[PDB]
């Protein structure tokens, strides 16, 4: 079997007309030389540009800029010179920030943002703000974002949120685009370069995440739960790479029913696996006017579903009055929950991954529920470490240690909502004897690691100091 082919114009069509072309410093008064905020300048430039029926280009010239919460607009095409450094402007209000928002609070049509030459840098290393994404996308169509390195500091926040937004009683999200030639350094395990929530006809290409997951197809979030709208469809990716992370490519549908995805050329070095699949699952949320306790919400649920059909309900945020519970993964329970609440576990349609190469290493991101898969090849749990509380205060959520497999697949969960990640020409390099090529639901495991008394990771290892950057 052969992969499906395509051309860049299938996703993104560049402008044929242009009314204006400006320079961020010369025309708008950005200062590339001090540490002042350049947000106003950038936005004034963007605004002036979208004013014109055919828009135009704005050049961001060499220098160091500070931007935050900028609002993109239709028919603006930003070009960024290769010695630019972009930094998040400081904001101490403790909320979730992004450098750039595309179709989040408006509607955006023909838009691009491109590094020239060898690419530029977004730098988070000196930021005091932990809550940062580079781009958040909503209602945007026909776009290209392209060319740069993100120097992260394990912030909370996939860097690029291919996300939904809410306008006039429905959800909206991005249709045709390309996101390509981006490297991320020093990402947090539970995050990475791309996270997708709602997406039609998007090409993801030449993307690399150091840590976490490069292409996270984990389709979750409030608005989609509530509106029963969103998810991803007809996604193409090529050249997805992981280093010192969980996975290059990950499928995790949650509650959303997703479309088709095709991936070619997946590589990883020193990651959990090159490809990862999770089963879908259902959470039932208690009503927002009823006052509930954990035990009362479990009871409402076991009442309609059965003894044993609810998992341990957790708290909705702070408050303590609103509750959510996972339906147990048993066809029976899942069946009644379908009949009774009209909702089921999520899945993906046709999924094909071509050319997967996983190179063994010693510094993968590892989840605690994966450690027992070392039983066959690493029966003394060598080279696995626990991060200190200063490094990560919820000890046991993340470990650093040897690669486990080419492909991890937890999808066999359930009967009716199972989905099929087809993989082709899968290779491993330098895995030890008795190790796993695929890990699934049936794979034999057995505790060999000290979960909470094993030795702790050096600062050097946690902070990836051995990696001297050369994007310079
Ligand atoms: Ca400045
Ligand atoms: Ni760097």
UniProtKB/Swiss-Prot annotation:
Localization annotation: Secreted
Q: What is this protein called?
A: Iota-carrageenase
What Enzyme Commission number(s) apply to this enzyme?
A: 3.2.1.157
By which gene is this protein encoded?
cgiA
- What are the protein's UniProt keywords? Carbohydrate metabolism, Cell wall biogenesis/degradation, Disulfide bond, Glycosidase, Hydrolase, Polysaccharide degradation, Secreted, Signal
- Catalyses which reaction(s): Endohydrolysis of 1,4-beta-D-linkages between D-galactose 4-sulfate and 3,6-anhydro-D-galactose-2-sulfate in iota-carrageenans
Entry similarity comment? Belongs to the glycosyl hydrolase 82 family.
Q: Which GO terms describe its biological process?
A: cell wall organization; polysaccharide catabolic process
Q: Recorded GO terms, molecular function? A: iota-carrageenase activity
Annotated Gene Ontology cellular component terms: extracellular region
* Main function: Hydrolyzes iota-carrageenans, sulfated 1,3-alpha-1,4-beta galactans from red algal cell walls, with an inversion of anomeric configuration. Also active against hybrid iota-/nu-carrageenan, not active against kappa- or lambda-carrageenans.
Q: Which InterPro entries does its entry note? A: Pectin_lyas_fold, Pectin_lyase_fold/virulence, RHGA/B-epi-like_pectate_lyase
Q: What is the lineage of its organism?
A: Bacteria, Pseudomonadati, Pseudomonadota, Gammaproteobacteria, Alteromonadales
> Disulfide connectivity?
242-271, 309-333, 381-449, 385-457
Known Pfam families for this protein?
Answer: Pect-lyase_RHGA_epim
């Amino acid at each position: 079997v052969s992969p499906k082919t395509y051309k860049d114009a299938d996703f993104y069509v560049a402008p044929t007309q242009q009314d204006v072309n400006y320079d961020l410093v010369d025309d708008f008064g950005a200062n590339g030389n001090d540490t002042s905020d350049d947000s106003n300048a950038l936005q004034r430039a963007i605004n002036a540009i979208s004013r014109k029926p055919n828009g135009g280009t704005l050049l961001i010239p060499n220098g160091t800029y500070h931007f935050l919460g900028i609002q993109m607009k239709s028919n603006v095409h930003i070009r960024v010179e290769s010695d630019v450094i972009i930094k998040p402007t400081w904001n101490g209000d403790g909320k979730n920030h992004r450098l750039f928002e595309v179709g989040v609070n408006n509607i955006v049509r023909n838009f691009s943002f491109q590094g020239l030459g060898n690419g530029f840098l977004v730098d988070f290393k000196d930021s005091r703000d932990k809550n940062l994404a580079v781009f958040k996308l909503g209602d945007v169509r026909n776009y290209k974002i392209s060319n740069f390195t993100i120097d992260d500091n394990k912030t909370i926040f996939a860097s690029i949120l291919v996300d939904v937004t809410e306008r006039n009683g429905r959800l909206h999200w991005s249709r045709n685009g390309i996101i390509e030639r981006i490297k991320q350094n020093n990402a947090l395990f539970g995050y990475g370069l791309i996270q997708t929530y709602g997406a039609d006809n998007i090409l993801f290409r030449n993307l690399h995440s150091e840590g976490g997951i490069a292409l996270r197809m984990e389709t979750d979030n409030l608005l989609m739960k509530n509106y029963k709208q969103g998810g991803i469809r007809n996604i193409f990716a090529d050249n997805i790479r992981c280093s010192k992370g969980l996975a290059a490519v990950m499928f995790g549908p949650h509650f959303m029913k997703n479309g088709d995805v095709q991936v070619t050329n997946v590589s990883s070095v020193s990651c959990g696996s090159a490809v990862r699949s999770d089963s879908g699952f259902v959470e039932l949320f208690s009503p927002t006017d009823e006052v509930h306790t954990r035990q009362s919400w479990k009871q409402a649920v076991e009442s309609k579903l059965g003894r044993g059909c609810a998992q341990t309900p957790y708290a909705r945020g702070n408050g303590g009055t609103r509750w959510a519970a996972r339906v147990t993964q048993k066809d029976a329970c899942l069946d009644k929950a379908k009949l009774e609440y009209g909702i089921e576990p999520g899945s993906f349609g046709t999924v094909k991954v071509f050319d997967v190469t996983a190179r063994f290493g010693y510094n993968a991101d590892l989840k605690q529920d994966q450690l027992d898969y070392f039983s066959t090849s690493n029966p003394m749990c060598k080279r696995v470490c626990l991060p200190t509380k200063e490094q990560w205060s919820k000890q046991g959520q993340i470990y650093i240690g040897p690669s486990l497999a080419a492909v991890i697949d937890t999808t066999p969960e359930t009967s009716k909502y199972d989905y099929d990640v087809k993989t082709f020409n899968v290779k491993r390099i330098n895995f030890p004897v008795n190790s796993h090529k695929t890990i699934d639901t049936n794979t034999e495991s057995s505790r060999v690691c000290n979960y909470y008394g094993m030795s702790e990771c050096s600062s050097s290892r946690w902070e990836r100091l051995e990696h001297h950057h050369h994007h310079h």
